[PDB]
Nucleic acid binder design. Structure first.
Length: 50
RNA sequence: AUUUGGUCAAUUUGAAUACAGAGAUCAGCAGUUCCCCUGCAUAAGGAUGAACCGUU
């Protein structure tokens, strides 16, 4: 039962160079790890911690 | 009171032969245009489905 769960569109933009080689879904144990993963495409800035 | 409205053409001629003059009728199908339905393609544009975790 997940009434708490929800989704929000954070961004809806245009990128100069698309460094994402494919669609590499993942899970990480921590936030730092996630950030690092994101920055594998030289783009940590996508994640919005709230 | 009379009379014109009355010349067959065609051919053989240097009047004779001709004798009215030479496809019909019934029925398909396709095309042309517009419309409607149906299946497919092409573009575009939606809508939606599908277990479960992925990739340095």
């Amino acid at each position: 039962d997940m009434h708490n769960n929800s989704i929000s569109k954070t961004w809806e933009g245009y990128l100069q160079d698309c460094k994402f080689k494919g669609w590499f879904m993942k899970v990480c144990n921590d936030q730092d790890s996630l950030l690092r993963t994101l920055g594998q495409f030289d783009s940590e800035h996508f994640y919005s911690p709230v």
